[PDB]
Amino acid sequence: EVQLVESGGGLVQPGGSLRLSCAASGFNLRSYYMHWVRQAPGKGLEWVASISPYYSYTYYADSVKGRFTISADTSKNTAYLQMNSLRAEDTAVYYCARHGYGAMDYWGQGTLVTVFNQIKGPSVFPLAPSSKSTSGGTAALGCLVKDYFPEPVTVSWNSGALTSGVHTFPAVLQSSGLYSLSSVVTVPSSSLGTQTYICNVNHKPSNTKVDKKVEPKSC
Amino acid sequence: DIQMTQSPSSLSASVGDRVTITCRASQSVSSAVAWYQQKPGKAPKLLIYSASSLYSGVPSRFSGSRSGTDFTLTISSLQPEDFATYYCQQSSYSLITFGQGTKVEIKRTVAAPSVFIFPPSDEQLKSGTASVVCLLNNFYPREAKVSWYVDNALQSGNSQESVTEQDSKDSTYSLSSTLTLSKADYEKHKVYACEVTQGTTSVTKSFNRGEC
Ligand SMILES: [Cl-]
Ligand SMILES: [Cl-]
Ligand SMILES: [Cl-]
Ligand SMILES: [N+]
Ligand code: NA
Ligand code: NA
Ligand code: NA
Ligand code: NA
Ligand code: NA
């Protein structure tokens, strides 16, 4: 069975370098064209580079010409993308893919490349449950996760014990150049004040975790 | 150079519906056009190649065609595993271009949101900024007008929205709108209100600064 496994993505600063690998199995890439295609978060597919069999001709998107180099080591059955002079616009999931029929018939799982010019851990503020909460009905509460960089943060509730009714919103890049998001959950109003609700916010880029107990605001 | 203009950017359909997605080339191009399907977190999957050839394993409800410089992907009878994002690809010599994608979402019946407003925390205020959050929980359709009023004055340019993908269980959306003010502006005003409009109904949730 044809398999492609990418590796090598990670965090890097502008002007930095990264080398991605694409390990092929189930076929010999010496007989095929291979491609790198990337996908910025929330956006569409963009072709990056291609390499031909036998002659090893290389082809590149205009925006990466002269900074990226595609190559292959047929003895390791592996393709590579050497990425130098990285810039913010290069942030993306990078796929390697095999050519077929003027298209791409097998794809790897992708590896994430995040170009970052700052590292800042989040501030976490309560979205406190309304005192007007409908008794016998449902109340909403949450955590506002503000001013972090780069992506991502993960949010859980009660260390993963609370999952039903949770909505963690896609992050928004603010005009400040920092991300924010909110995570909310609906619960029975009758549980407010006697059931503990804690949001667990992890930001691995800054090695920061915040746990915030969200209580009704005292009056 | 070559551009593939894909339309529509998104559409809602029901199981059994006939779905048409179009990519318009900016100039004359070869028929080396492929279609992919992609689900969240997953790699694309090849559906069609050479504009109209079905890739093996792909069920026969998928087909592709070409007219002039218009390429079309058709799903004859939409099935539940077909809700996804679709992309066209054009190859001309070495240059490979993709359309910007089409998200195919599921139709369901109308559902009004539960609306909640959240004042800024006292802890945030001491930083000098105030975030006011309005939540629209589990509603359909996605289109909604969310307006902020501060002492009955309509706000513009100081709020942003975020929306979840369709829920896997109930096919609804949820949406947040966050109004961002300086602490000084926040403490100058009293009534904060989020007004949510869909069709013939508006729901406004408010609070008075200081009152609990
Ligand atoms: Cl070359
Ligand atoms: Cl749960
Ligand atoms: Cl304004
Ligand atoms: N006021
Ligand atoms: Na991706
Ligand atoms: Na709050
Ligand atoms: Na996220
Ligand atoms: Na408690
Ligand atoms: Na789209």
Q: What ligand has the least distance to the C-alpha of B207?
A: 6
Cβ atoms of A94 and A9 closer than 8 Å: yes
C-alpha B71/C-alpha B76 separation (Å) is: 16
Cβ atoms of A114 and A91 closer than 8 Å: yes
Cis peptide bond prior to B8, omega within 30° of 0? yes
Cis peptide bond prior to B113, omega within 30° of 0? no
C-alpha B5/C-alpha B23 separation (Å) is: 5
Cβ atoms of B64 and B48 closer than 8 Å: yes
Tell me which chain A residues have a C-beta less than 8 angstroms from the C-beta of B196.
none
Q: Would you mind telling me the total number of residues written for chain A in this entry?
A: 219
Q: In 3D, which of B91, B150, B144 has the Cα closest to residue B113?
A: B144
A119 torsion bin: left (phi>0), alpha (psi -120 to 50), beta (else)? beta
Kindly state the tokens that stand for A147: 């001013």
Residue A132 CB-density burial (10 A; 0-12 exposed, 13-18 middle, 19+ buried): exposed
C-alpha B125/C-alpha B109 separation (Å) is: 41
C-alpha A6/C-alpha A126 separation (Å) is: 39
C-alpha B191/C-alpha B208 separation (Å) is: 5
Q: Quick one: resolution in A?
A: 1.8
Q: What ligand has the least distance to the C-alpha of A69?
A: 1
Residue A219 CB-density burial (10 A; 0-12 exposed, 13-18 middle, 19+ buried): exposed
Strand partners of residue B194: B148, B205
Residue A63 has phi, psi (to 5 degrees) of -70, -15
C-alpha B179/C-alpha A203 separation (Å) is: 24
Residue A88's CB is within 10 A of a number of other CB atoms, namely: 12
Q: Which residues contact A120 (CB under 8 A, 6 or more apart)?
A: A147, A148, A149, A178, A206
Residue in A96, A132, A169, A173 to test binding to B, most B beta-carbons within 10 Å:
A169
In Å, how far are A51, A98, B20, B160 from B36, measured between CA atoms? 21, 14, 14, 32
C-alpha B141/C-alpha B138 separation (Å) is: 10
Residue A181 CB-density burial (10 A; 0-12 exposed, 13-18 middle, 19+ buried): buried
Q: In 3D, which of A90, A146, A88 has the Cα closest to residue A122?
A: A146
Residue pairs spanning A and B at CB distance below 8 A: 122
Residue B34's CB is within 10 A of a number of other CB atoms, namely: 29
